[PDB]
Design an enzyme around this catalytic site. Sequence first.
Site, PDB file in Angstrom:
ATOM      1  N   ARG D 301       5.557   0.996   0.125  1.00 35.48           N
ATOM      2  CA  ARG D 301       6.033   1.985  -0.349  1.00 35.48           C
ATOM      3  C   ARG D 301       6.385   1.583  -2.158  1.00 35.48           C
ATOM      4  NH1 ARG D 301       8.770   2.580   4.411  1.00 35.48           N
ATOM      5  NH2 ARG D 301      10.908   1.701   3.698  1.00 35.48           N
ATOM      6  N   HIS D 343     -10.675   1.791  -0.020  1.00 38.91           N
ATOM      7  CA  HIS D 343     -11.072   0.386  -0.477  1.00 38.91           C
ATOM      8  C   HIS D 343     -12.338  -0.424  -0.320  1.00 38.91           C
ATOM      9  CE1 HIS D 343      -6.640   0.683  -1.345  1.00 38.91           C
ATOM     10  NE2 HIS D 343      -6.777  -0.350  -2.237  1.00 38.91           N
TER      11      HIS D 343
END
Lengths: 409, 409, 409, 409
Positions: D301, D343
């Site tokens: 986070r 990614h």
Amino acid sequence: QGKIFIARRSLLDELLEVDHIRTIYHMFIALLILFILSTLVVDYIDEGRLVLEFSLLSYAFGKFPTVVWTWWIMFLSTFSVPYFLFQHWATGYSKSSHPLIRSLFHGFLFMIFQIGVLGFGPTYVVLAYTLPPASRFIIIFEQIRFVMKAHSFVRENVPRVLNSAKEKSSTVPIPTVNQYLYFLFAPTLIYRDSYPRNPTVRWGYVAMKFAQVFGCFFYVYYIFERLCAPLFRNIKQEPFSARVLVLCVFNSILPGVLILFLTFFAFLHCWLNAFAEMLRFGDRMFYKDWWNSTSYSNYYRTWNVVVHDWLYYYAYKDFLWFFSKRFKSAAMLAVFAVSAVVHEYALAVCLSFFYPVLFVLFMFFGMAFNFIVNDSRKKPIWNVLMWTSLFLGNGVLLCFYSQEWYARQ
Amino acid sequence: QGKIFIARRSLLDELLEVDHIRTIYHMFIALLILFILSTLVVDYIDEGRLVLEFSLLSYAFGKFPTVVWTWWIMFLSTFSVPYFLFQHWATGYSKSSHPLIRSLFHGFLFMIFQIGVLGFGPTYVVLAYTLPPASRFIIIFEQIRFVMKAHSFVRENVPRVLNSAKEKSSTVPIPTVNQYLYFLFAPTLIYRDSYPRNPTVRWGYVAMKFAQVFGCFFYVYYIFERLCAPLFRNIKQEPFSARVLVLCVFNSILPGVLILFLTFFAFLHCWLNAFAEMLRFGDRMFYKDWWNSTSYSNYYRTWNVVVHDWLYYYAYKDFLWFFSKRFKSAAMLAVFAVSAVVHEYALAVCLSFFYPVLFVLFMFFGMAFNFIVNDSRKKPIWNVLMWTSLFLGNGVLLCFYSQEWYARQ
Amino acid sequence: QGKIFIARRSLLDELLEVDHIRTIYHMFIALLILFILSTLVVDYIDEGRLVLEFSLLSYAFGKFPTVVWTWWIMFLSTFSVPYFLFQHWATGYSKSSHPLIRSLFHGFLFMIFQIGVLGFGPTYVVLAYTLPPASRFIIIFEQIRFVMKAHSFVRENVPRVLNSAKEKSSTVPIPTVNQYLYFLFAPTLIYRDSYPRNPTVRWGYVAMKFAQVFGCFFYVYYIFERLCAPLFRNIKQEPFSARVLVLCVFNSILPGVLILFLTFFAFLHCWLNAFAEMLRFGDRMFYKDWWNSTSYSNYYRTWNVVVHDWLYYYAYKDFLWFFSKRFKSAAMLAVFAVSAVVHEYALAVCLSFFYPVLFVLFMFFGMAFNFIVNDSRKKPIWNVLMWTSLFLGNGVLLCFYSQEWYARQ
Amino acid sequence: QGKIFIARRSLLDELLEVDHIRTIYHMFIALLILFILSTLVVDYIDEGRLVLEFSLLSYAFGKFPTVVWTWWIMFLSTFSVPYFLFQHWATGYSKSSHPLIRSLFHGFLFMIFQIGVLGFGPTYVVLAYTLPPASRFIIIFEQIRFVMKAHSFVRENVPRVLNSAKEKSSTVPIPTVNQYLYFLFAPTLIYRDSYPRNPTVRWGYVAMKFAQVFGCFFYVYYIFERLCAPLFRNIKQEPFSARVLVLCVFNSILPGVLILFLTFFAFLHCWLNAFAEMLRFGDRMFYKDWWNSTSYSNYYRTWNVVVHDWLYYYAYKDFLWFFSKRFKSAAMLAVFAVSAVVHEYALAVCLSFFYPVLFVLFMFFGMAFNFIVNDSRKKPIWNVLMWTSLFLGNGVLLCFYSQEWYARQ
Ligand SMILES: CC(C)(COP(=O)(O)OP(=O)(O)OC[C@H]1O[C@@H](n2cnc3c(N)ncnc32)[C@H](O)[C@@H]1OP(=O)(O)O)[C@@H](O)C(=O)NCCC(=O)NCCS
Ligand SMILES: CC(C)(COP(=O)(O)OP(=O)(O)OC[C@H]1O[C@@H](n2cnc3c(N)ncnc32)[C@H](O)[C@@H]1OP(=O)(O)O)[C@@H](O)C(=O)NCCC(=O)NCCS
Ligand SMILES: CC(C)c1cccc(C(C)C)c1NC(=O)NCC1(c2ccc(N(C)C)cc2)CCCC1
Ligand SMILES: CC(C)c1cccc(C(C)C)c1NC(=O)NCC1(c2ccc(N(C)C)cc2)CCCC1
Ligand SMILES: CC(C)CCC[C@@H](C)[C@H]1CC[C@H]2[C@@H]3CC=C4C[C@@H](O)CC[C@]4(C)[C@H]3CC[C@]12C
Ligand SMILES: CC(C)CCC[C@@H](C)[C@H]1CC[C@H]2[C@@H]3CC=C4C[C@@H](O)CC[C@]4(C)[C@H]3CC[C@]12C
Ligand SMILES: CC(C)CCC[C@@H](C)[C@H]1CC[C@H]2[C@@H]3CC=C4C[C@@H](O)CC[C@]4(C)[C@H]3CC[C@]12C
Ligand SMILES: CC(C)CCC[C@@H](C)[C@H]1CC[C@H]2[C@@H]3CC=C4C[C@@H](O)CC[C@]4(C)[C@H]3CC[C@]12C
């Protein structure tokens, strides 16, 4: 002036009940027992049954009856002759039948007695009758006793009559037979009249001391039989000085230390206290605390007081009187000489051989240990250096003499 | 009930300035000087200029890095683990997380520590990594120390926490780690908190004691050459038990008594008082007046107090607590069994050979001597029989162990 | 005038619990784990099972018994001789036994001690008895310690006795030997009496610090293999100074900064605070906030405070006292000369080769950096130029010394 | 519900003036300078005059004009098409000309736009026009930006009209062009209307940040030119995995750590703060303290909040909405899958080769580091284990990819 007698107990007597010195007594008793046990076991396993009689003491104390009658005739001579020659001065200086002649005449009659009786007689029997080494020391010891007792008697009582002779029509003081005979067994060599005495004889005290003297004599025998037997009786091979001499001197210290302690306690303290109690005597301060003395400051005086006082009052101070005052030199040499000459002679007679390194050890070092040490030194390290020198001196003594004795057999 | 500490001085320290026992100090100093002089003269004439390194201490104190190796791991482990395992009872019985199982779990962990790390660890090191004698003795001596110190810590502090646990909701007593560490260097094996402490430290005192301990260690070394070397190093011909054994025991008595007196004074008084002064410790009653002691009735409780107290309070009294009351037989034999096995263990590890005659000599006679003599006899003859027994016992000990050590090559 | 001690904590210790710097601690811990994992994997696949003994530390920490050998003789000498020579002024100037000659006599004896026993002694040992690098550093580091401790003792206590001597008939101040000994283990080189002390000791703190120091020593070891070994151990071909030197300096910067940070934290904070906690010591300002420091104006007085204080109070201020007033040139160059020679001496003894570029780097630039930068500049650009200079300076230092060490074989 | 915006400063901005974190800034500046100095010296001694242009950046950023117009046409498409398709809902649900048809029709018209324009267009130019690896990342980064901005626009504004459609005879809310164009340059992907804003633009703040971004970009270049040049450009011999792989991974850590820190500070913090100040924006809390986070508890986070919130609110929570409630499983797998797939794709396009160990490293371990770790863990050792895993993960990443890139040349 002179020695003054005070009713005192012996130092070691009162000091043997501190509860820490009595331990050392019991340690030495325990070592006596362990010496006896060891010797009895060794002698048992070597031979058949255990040794009944010691066998060394039979050879060592050999012809005893001839020591008894030569002592008796020496005792009768030193009792009778000096007293009768001094009782001849009952007239003395009263009528004064040409003085200066009779004084030196009776002086020469005393000197011919001193030399003729005690010089030859004791030496003649020990040398001519081939007595054994240990038995000869008794005759020589008793000779040196009675020559001191006789000279002490003459030297002290002459001042009385010689001072009293100036007073006209006065009673001359002469010693009686009883008090002189009392002096001749007393444990001090100073006065003739009215010694300080104790109230009563204990008789248990004398019994315990005579038991200790007997126990000490056996200890000294067992010392020579186990400490001085194995390494002096046996050795005879490769006769060289390479290292063996240093070890023979070293291993002979531990015997020497115990011999020095036993010869002190047995004879000086215990034997004299026994006679000082048996026969009424109050002084008993015939040795002092040399244990913590600075090397040869007090050691000379404190070791034997009875024989020191003999030398101090009648050899040293009389020499200083004869030379008046101010020397502290050849007088000190003369008293060290006569003391060394009496020792070397006494030792020379018993073994019949001479070789006195003892005289060189007493002459050279006995000077060194007084003149370059002084009395004013107070450091505790000097007690260590005394005790080192005493240990080595006595160890070298016992080594070289017992070597020389067994070397001539 | 437990031992109560009072600010005293060591009895010998108090008694060493009485002016007659300071002689015996100087007697032994003088004998050290004469031992050094004898050895240096012999070594000079034998080989070369003089002895540079002693040669015995080089072998005896051999691999000394692997001893520091041991001691420091042993010191860090006995400092860390015993305290941490006990400090883990901070939660303790206060929380009461199911007691009786966790208590025995930590008791098991402490037992595994004691045996595995101190019982097995250092003994494995000395046996696996080959070390010479007199070097191993340091590891096993300091091992036995830290085992006693660790047991003493737990056994005294368990009653505190258990008694504090009876009354709930209280500040659990746990000793701080300055305490215990102070105890781990303190010269006594009993308490944790608030020992009697002297107000200041002298440091001239400890310098004199470490100088004496340094002198004693050498004295003891000098004992092995000039006193024992000739009769053990050399003898190798005609292997018979005819007369040589009794002679060898008799000749080994006189070194024995000196070894016993030196190992007493050097360690038990001098070294232990040096630590007791350097570190602030007030009691200093490490030994009582055992010199003038009744034979074997009280020798055990006056010879070495710090080890006796540990035994009496934690082995003897705990055994009497476990068996409740009335035995004086199981307890006597148990403490004797613990001590004699540990002594045999200590002396069997260092030479790596066994021959435990020392065990049977302590077992058979040490019982008798406690029981036949009694504490009720007060006659001085028993003191003689103590010194006879101790002289013979130590003479037989030193002879037989040296005979066995020199025989294995 | 003199340093005044206040009960503080180490700034990093205070700052390490801010929750952002504890990250950097964990960053370096994580990099240690990854260094260990990398080395163990490489060693496994290369040779056998895994690395048993590290091999570098075996050579580097080589003959460690002959270091304990040194340290203990060095510790006993510096404890005994400096205090005893100063304590010999107990009579001091109070008696006044012809002063000015006896003062310089004891000053000469102390100089002969300092040079002969600490200046020449340990350096002779490491050079004569061949020792490896990193083992010699212990002897020379602990040497320089005891020289400073000895000088600090005398220089602070001379003013007391001289000021006390001005007013006659008074109690001469001499520090007790618990003090000074406490100072000899205390982590500061300034005062004798009444340091600020904390009320208790934690012992969990010191356990964590010695765990960190143990981890740092390894971290530093891991630095020499995985970070430096490949580029120094291997290279031996085409001896030219074309591009390889700049590359080698650049590659040696990144190990350099880690070595500087590890040698800082491990010794100066962690090890020194461990002693400052284990022993009761309250100040703990061994280093100030030198991180955010102006470039070279104050780096010297905030990097290492204990050495800086010793220099500033006893070398700098005493030189200003001797020359009275107004130089700031002779004093600056003198303290730089003392420090740079001692650093070169420290690093020339261990590797036995000389090459003192370190001296000219500290002399030439270290002057400039003190004088051109000044304490008046407060812009943050200077801090960048400090870190640039320090990174390059240490990178050139490590490269050139390692190049020279590996070149001699 | 949803993210709520509060006017906050960035964490590192306020934390860069503590006076201990500003040191690390200056350390990294000092290392930038020393990198530049080293490279300029090496390039000077190798060639003639010093390198004018870098030469790598010319190849790395090659055909730049085609990146400019493809970005422009991508910006014009994502601005015009989603807004016009959403402005087609101006009628929307007001007249309601057969709903369910037009909603999914315009939904499919949005999907064909998303795939047709941004799926092909960006990939087509980079693959077809053979652009260089570094220049391709710009197009892919900006593609992933605008696809997020477009989906965020549609997903948030649909709830407004779909709720407001229930109310009869009411004004439909439609976003204007100005505030949407403002959002399309804003540094957050959440709301469209009334962001919290600051009072005034500083203009000195944005200049300093853009200078830092420029300095960081140069640092990242010099990292690859000196840390990743010498060992990847050069090596080609003895192609074996024996030990070289472990060292190549190990030596690539130290570059990887700085690349991770620079790519954070340059882009995330410094570049977004510059645009957040230049264009009025108040939130600036787009990263949090991950430095001391438990491994992958907050790290997920706290690293990027802008892209995390994108995934949390619109991928994770929308998936949980579509499946209603209660999974914490395949939803978590799907968000990890889409994140890993975005990614691996972005990296695959630029180098035109595939080989994604990255996906296996994100799939296998990215699960492992969340499910078997938990969020409730509080021990500081888990921060070390995070930082170990992050260091190794990024080091293995940079090693294997830069190996693979130079392997295909
Ligand atoms: C167990 C050991 C301490 C023996 O001594 P002990 O335990 O103290 O003897 P005790 O205290 O139990 O005996 C007490 C009795 O002794 C008598 N006694 C006399 N004086 C006493 C005194 N001052 N204190 C205690 N008891 C005394 C009493 O009759 C007393 O009776 P009590 O039960 O009413 O108290 C001892 O043998 C030991 O632990 N270790 C030495 C063994 C060893 O290591 N030998 C190695 C070879 S030498
Ligand atoms: C000598 C040494 C301590 C330098 O620092 P210093 O002596 O404390 O500097 P000074 O205190 O004499 O200078 C004082 C001046 O500095 C300025 N100054 C600013 N802040 C100051 C402060 N807090 N305290 C003192 N001076 C301050 C003032 O101008 C002050 O003027 P003043 O004379 O009126 O007091 C230091 O170089 C040293 O001893 N060793 C380090 C050298 C070394 O070992 N190098 C190895 C290689 S890196
Ligand atoms: C002298 C000994 C036999 C003895 C007699 C009576 C009572 C005790 C203790 C247990 C209270 C001991 N044991 C002792 O004192 N051990 C400690 C020392 C010791 C002596 C000898 C040995 N051995 C070589 C067995 C071990 C320790 C004393 C000197 C150094 C430590
Ligand atoms: C870091 C060093 C160059 C330096 C910079 C600024 C000021 C000082 C002192 C003199 C106040 C020093 N010197 C120092 O701190 N010496 C002590 C230590 C030291 C460091 C290096 C060396 N050398 C190998 C020369 C010797 C001692 C630090 C770590 C271990 C002890
Ligand atoms: C300095 C070196 C040679 C160490 C010598 C240690 C000395 C001081 C020790 C060893 C043995 C000790 C002796 C042990 C036995 C006794 C018996 C006691 O009833 C009186 C004290 C006395 C006599 C002790 C006094 C001190 C002593 C002689
Ligand atoms: C056969 C047995 C009983 C004879 C033993 C004789 C004993 C009692 C003698 C011999 C030597 C004497 C010791 C000579 C030396 C000293 C040193 C002194 O500071 C204390 C007394 C002390 C310790 C003496 C006490 C008694 C002693 C030990
Ligand atoms: C070209 C130069 C200026 C770019 C340098 C970027 C600098 C400012 C960045 C890169 C990584 C950053 C660090 C990342 C890690 C931490 C750990 C944290 O607990 C304190 C802040 C600190 C130490 C950061 C401060 C700023 C930092 C050092
Ligand atoms: C545990 C092992 C690996 C030892 C590690 C030592 C660590 C704790 C030491 C080494 C160097 C130290 C750092 C030296 C430099 C600075 C810069 C300053 O502005 C913040 C603190 C910080 C970042 C220090 C924190 C602690 C530190 C990182």
